[PDB]
Amino acid sequence: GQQHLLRFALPAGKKLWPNDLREALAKHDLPPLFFSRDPQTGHAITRAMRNEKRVRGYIEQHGHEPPPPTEEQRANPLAIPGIRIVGSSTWVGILATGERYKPLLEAATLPAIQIVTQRCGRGVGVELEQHTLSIKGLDDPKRYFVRNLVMKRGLTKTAENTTQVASRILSALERQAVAYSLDLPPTAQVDIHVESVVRPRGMRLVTSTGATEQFVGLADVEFYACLDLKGYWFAGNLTSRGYGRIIADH
RNA sequence: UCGGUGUUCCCCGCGCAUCGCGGGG
């Protein structure tokens, strides 16, 4: 429900992408959960079993019933990143969503200041934003962007990507709404229109274990929707690294 | 808001379940 954004305004010259900050913070002694890695599995956070009926199939699959979910799985059944490293070309920061994840942001605050000030020299601005996530229907379309939407699969260069992207956004909203016990306005009210899918392109997937041969689809988005979002909402994949950030146009 | 130009390194969810749709880094 409650979000804290630690935001560093970068000096005119210098860039510091979310992934650079993330990797630099990897050199400090921060808990795995800060990087959306489950400390009780050693893997990235992911979902446990949802449907009881699969136990049977699990058993013959593995020779035993499924283990109890990890603490992060019980707390975060949909595997939504409680910590994201976010930013654009002009700023970089750390978004904690939920009181569970606020101590991680605290732990990482001074390391992050060190990293940003070292990389950028003098001039770095800082803000701490507080939001509570909310979603409400409107009578008129509000304009939005999605910065660096990532779709691991299904992003094409042909025009129907516009609707392919729309579906993803909707799913994302539902996903987040379910995660945070928020009520979704009806799809017919939302009336999402992806006005634009800019520069559909590829991006090599790099993980904690190294760069991979999988590429994912990457693109920037303009869309409209009769929706009022409070707080920071995301769509697409790899949002723990700031990808897919929904930005209200002002 | 618009740096990476194109698909598997490994974890997972769901389903009209050697497949199909998705999720995590």
Q: Domain extents for chain A?
A: 2-36+81-131, 134-248
CATH number for the region A134-248 comes to: 3.30.70
Q: Which residues of A are annotated as a binding site for Mn(2+)?
A: 191, 193
Note the CA–C1' distance, A19 to B13, in angstroms: 27
* Cα(A179)–Cα(A51) distance, integer angstroms: 17
Query: What is the total residue count of chain A?
Result: 250
E-strand ranges in A33-103 read 83-87, 91-97
Listed as own residue / partner, the contacts of A206-215 with beta carbons closer than 8 Å and 24 or more positions apart are A206/A19, A208/A26, A208/A35, A208/A37, A214/A152
Note the CA–C1' distance, A170 to B15, in angstroms: 20
**Which method was used?**
X-ray
Q: Which residues of A are annotated as a binding site?
A: 191, 193
Note the CA–C1' distance, A125 to B13, in angstroms: 41
The data reach a resolution, in angstroms, of: 2.3
Residue A53, class by beta-carbon neighbours within 10 Å (0-12 exposed, 13-18 middle, 19+ buried)?
Answer: exposed
**Phi, psi torsion values for A57, nearest 5 degrees:** -65, -40
What are the structure tokens assigned to A197, written together? Answer: 């899918």
The nucleotide lying nearest A84 (C-alpha to C1') is B25
Q: Which nucleotides of B are covered by protein (CB under 7 A)?
A: 1-15, 17, 21-25
Note the CA–C1' distance, A99 to B12, in angstroms: 25
The nucleotide lying nearest A199 (C-alpha to C1') is B2
CB atoms within 10 A of CB A239: 25
* Cα(A48)–Cα(A70) distance, integer angstroms: 8
Note the CA–C1' distance, A31 to B1, in angstroms: 31
CB atoms within 10 A of CB A238: 24
CATH architecture of A2-36+81-131: 2-Layer Sandwich (3.30)
Q: Do domains A2-36+81-131 and A134-248 have the same CATH topology?
A: yes
Which amino acid residue lies closest to nucleotide B4, measuring CA to C1'?
Answer: A203
Run of H or E residues at A173? helix A161-179
Which amino acid residue lies closest to nucleotide B8, measuring CA to C1'?
Answer: A214
